[PDB]
Design a protein around this nucleic acid. Structure first.
Ligand SMILES: [Mg+2]
Lengths: 263, 49, 97, 49, 99, 98, 49, 49, 49
DNA sequence: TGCATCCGTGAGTCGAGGGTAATAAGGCAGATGAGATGAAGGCGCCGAAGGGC
DNA sequence: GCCCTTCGGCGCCTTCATCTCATCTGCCTATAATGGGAGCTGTCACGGATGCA
């Protein structure tokens, strides 16, 4: 308030004010460092899944950092009681959106957690694995969504773990590269292109060009009739007629047998 | 450095070569085998190639 | 490992921008150093960073070391096409060539 | 008769699939395979000239 | 050879539809969309490959055309808010009798 | 041990006389442990059965590798040898050539 | 914040320790936040003061 | 028809010396067993177990 | 039902179960369009894996 | 200056053999891009047929 | 026997708005709750820092 819309700070209103500012700073730091023991104690029950121990400790430290600002002493409860809720919130949020290789929104990691807890609570009471329809009855939602969430929660595996009983090879050695070119269908495609060129050249040149730019062979884009008219000085009905002539002559078994084989 | 790094103590020789800014000639046997060039022996020399 | 590096870096950025006591900042910087450590060479310092199944993770260095490293497994000797394999049987009626 | 019959022991390929990271063909009978041409055979081929 | 599904029925010759036994007149391209739906009954339909196969590959328009056409299919045969022609967010549509 | 840890955690977080053994018990780790043992463990392996003798010899076989054992790289020359105490206990002939 | 490459800090010779005339036992204490170092000193500001 | 004078290499792991890879000329044979000339066994260190 | 009759002989390459998967979408080659235009073949919107 | 003390390197060739797990988390406000709607314009296509050379 | 050139008719085909339906992101919960689970290490040889004394 005194920096913008203020005045030249006097002796007693600048140094003392900055001193109480720093005093509050070190007081906050002091209680924070004193209460990190609570964070590290609470993080013990939270390890064993997703993230490491020290990462959880650090996230709890951030949660306590946030909590100390909103802590109200005037309400007259111990600081630990208020800080525990914020620490738990920070840890849960971090484990939700940070502990997964495939990140999952919290809004539905919540329902994965609830599905797991209800299924494992009902398993011991009923003695058997809970069928997903009964789980859906406990969900008040359609079972199909239950199978969907069940298959969403599945986490990825490692490509480099040894797969055999004896250690000799990794998983990644047994996965085929789908994106690789077949090296057989490529030559087939080239010869098919050659056959198409021969067939089109056998046809009349106007028809060959019309169909070539109709299906976008020589260029990247097939074109509508009006483009064909503008490039050949004819109406679009004439182009429809010449296209009719094209596939009429193309049904000729001389071309039909020689090209149909290529499949 | 390319030949040495592929024989033994890969990290050590790799670090040493990085420090020394060693410029490999890509002229030896194993280097040409690695990079796909003709090996400098037998039918790979310029007299016969 | 890259996810761990990213998480530690982002949390350190948050700590610095927010303003935190120097102990937490030092702890985060140590975690960043150890995370880059694990990324470049897992298990070189301290216990190796472990994932699921309780096995050491494969860092960049482990991908260039030993028999299973790239150098002596994919560069020096490669699986080749146009090849086969079968049991051998004596051919006493064959010619030497 | 032992369980090492030649029918389950003959394998050959012209152009099969390939691995992801490196474009080398895979190995084994379940996959289309491809024999490993290791560095020890590289020694022999280099010695031949 | 007439293709049937629940209460919609199609004759491949004269390009008309019966909805619960009532004949209905419908637009040609809209009819092609319905033909795709019946020819892939029980399989989900996505706007792209719908555009790829049914529509010409030269189509330079926006994406609202297919949504509007589905709206016409709804108002012609499946007038109910819940309808046999279910819609998937980001994955398109599907012809399916609701469970 | 996992059971004891989880029940020790739970017995305090709940008020007295409102706590029952069923809610103290969560049998998940026990079945998880037995499933961990029976599958993806190298000491409980796929039965080698292509004749009655192979089935007979797969059981009643003494192994040395696995959890608590020594790996082949970890194995020295002394262990692979035949001890004089092997007589009558473990056959000195039947052992794989690999 | 900057970090140190392990290949150079940690090894049979600690290359960073060799260049900076220290020991790896006297470097892990610093690049892992256990002990401080004196980056620079003011010589004249101490000689006159 | 196509195997007319087309050389084909034969190898046996482990390939100790240079003669562990030999180029022959193949003749079509029934069955599924590669027929090796009995003389080149010693060079191959090959045996029919 | 889509599977081989019981007591029927098969060999390498013969189909065993007819399982058809929705192919989704891909780049339909223009040459494919001319191919269907010559014979009247349907698009066959599914993949025969 | 020893001198134990450790600390990082090396240790085979092709082939049987595929994947294993916890926990207190819940309303609530806003927003946001996808998809549901309705309305209006720019030809299509004909429904008529003009007509003659 | 059909080209040159018509009004218009709703259709239809887009396209502009313009509304909802999930879907996802940030915020708040007050008795007290205050310092790791577990890890099993040891082949064989061989060059080199190394903490002290
Ligand atoms: Mg032999």
């Amino acid at each position: 308030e005194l920096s913008e819309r203020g005045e030249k700070l006097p002796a007693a209103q600048r140094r003392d004010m900055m001193w109480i500012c720093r005093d509050g700073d070190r007081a906050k730091n002091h209680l924070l460092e004193a209460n990190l023991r609570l964070v590290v104690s609470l993080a013990k029950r939270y390890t064993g899944r997703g993230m490491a121990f020290l990462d959880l400790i650090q996230e709890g430290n951030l949660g306590l950092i946030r909590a100390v600002e909103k802590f109200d002493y005037t309400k007259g409860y111990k600081f630990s009681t208020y800080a525990t809720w914020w620490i738990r919130q920070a840890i849960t949020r971090a484990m939700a959106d940070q502990a997964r290789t495939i990140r999952i929104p919290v809004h539905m990691v919540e329902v994965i957690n609830k599905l797991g807890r209800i299924q494992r609570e009902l398993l011991q009471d009923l003695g058997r694995e809970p069928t997903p329809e009964e789980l859906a009855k406990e969900m008040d939602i359609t079972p199909e969504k239950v199978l969907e969430i069940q298959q969403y929660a599945r986490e990825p595996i490692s490509l480099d773990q040894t797969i055999g009983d004896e250690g000799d090879s990794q998983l990644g050695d047994f996965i085929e590269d789908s994106e690789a070119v077949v090296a057989v269908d490529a030559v087939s495609f080239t010869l098919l292109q050659d056959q198409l060129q021969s067939v089109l050249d056998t046809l009349s040149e106007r028809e060959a060009g019309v169909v070539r730019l109709r299906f976008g062979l020589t260029d990247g884009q097939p074109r509508t009739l009006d483009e064909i008219g503008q490039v050949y000085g004819v109406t679009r009905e004439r182009i429809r007629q010449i296209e009719s002539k094209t596939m009429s002559k193309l049904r000729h078994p001389s071309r039909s047998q020689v090209l149909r084989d290529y499949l | 450095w390319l030949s040495a790094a592929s024989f033994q103590e890969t990290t050590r020789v790799l670090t040493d070569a990085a420090i020394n800014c060693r410029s490999d000639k890509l002229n030896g046997l194993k280097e040409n085998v690695i990079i796909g060039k003709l090996i400098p022996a037998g039918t790979g020399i310029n007299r016969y190639r | 490992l890259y996810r761990r590096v990213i998480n530690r870096n982002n949390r350190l950025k948050r700590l610095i921008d927010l303003g935190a006591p120097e102990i937490i900042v030092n702890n985060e910087k140590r975690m960043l150093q150890e995370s880059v450590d694990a990324l470049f060479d897992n298990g070189r310092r301290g216990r190796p960073v472990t994932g699921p199944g309780n096995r050491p993770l494969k860092s960049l260095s482990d991908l260039l070391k030993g028999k299973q490293g790239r150098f002596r497994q994919n560069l020096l000797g490669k699986r080749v096409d146009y090849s086969g394999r079968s049991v051998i049987v004596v051919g006493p009626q064959l010619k030497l060539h | 008769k032992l369980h090492h019959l030649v029918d389950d022991k003959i394998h050959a390929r012209s152009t099969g699939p390939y691995s992801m990271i490196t474009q080398q063909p895979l190995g084994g009978k379940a996959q289309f395979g491809g024999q490993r041409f290791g560095e020890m055979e590289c020694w022999a081929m280099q010695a031949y000239g | 050879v007439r293709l049937t599904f629940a209460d919609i029925e199609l004759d491949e010759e004269t390009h008309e539809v019966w909805k619960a036994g009532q004949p209905v007149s419908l637009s040609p391209t809209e009819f092609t969309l319905l033909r795709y739906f019946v020819i892939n009954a029980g399989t989900v339909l996505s706007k792209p490959k719908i555009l790829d196969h049914v529509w010409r590959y030269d189509f330079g328009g926006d994406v609202n055309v297919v949504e509007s056409y589905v709206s016409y299919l709804r108002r012609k045969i499946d007038t109910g808010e819940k309808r046999l022609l279910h819609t998937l967010r980001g994955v398109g549509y599907v012809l399916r009798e609701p469970r | 041990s996992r059971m004891e840890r989880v029940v020790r955690e739970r017995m305090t977080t709940q008020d007295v006389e409102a706590i029952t053994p069923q809610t103290l018990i969560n049998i998940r780790p026990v079945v998880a442990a037995i499933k961990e043992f029976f599958g993806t463990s190298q000491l409980s392996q796929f039965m080698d059965q292509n004749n009655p003798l192979s089935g007979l010899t797969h059981k009643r076989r003494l192994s040395a590798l696995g959890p608590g054992g020594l790996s082949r790289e970890r194995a020295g020359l002394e262990v692979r040898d035949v001890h004089p105490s092997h007589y009558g206990r473990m056959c000195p002939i039947e052992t794989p050539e690999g | 914040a900057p970090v140190t490459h392990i290949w150079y800090f940690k090894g049979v010779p600690s290359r960073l320790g060799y260049l900076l005339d220290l020991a790896p036992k006297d470097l892990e204490k610093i690049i892992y936040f256990a002990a401080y170092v004196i980056t620079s000193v003011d010589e004249e500001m101490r000689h006159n003061e | 028809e196509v195997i007319a004078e087309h050389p084909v290499l034969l190898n046996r792991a482990p390939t100790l010396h240079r003669l562990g890879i030999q180029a022959f000329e193949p003749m079509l044979v029934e069955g599924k067993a590669i027929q090796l000339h009995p003389l080149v066994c010693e060079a191959f260190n090959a045996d029919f177990d | 039902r889509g599977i081989v009759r019981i007591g029927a002989e098969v060999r390498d390459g013969d189909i065993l179960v007819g399982k058809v998967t929705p192919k989704g979408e891909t780049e339909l080659t223009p040459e494919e369009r001319l191919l269907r235009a010559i014979f009247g073949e349907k698009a066959r919107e599914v993949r025969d894996t």
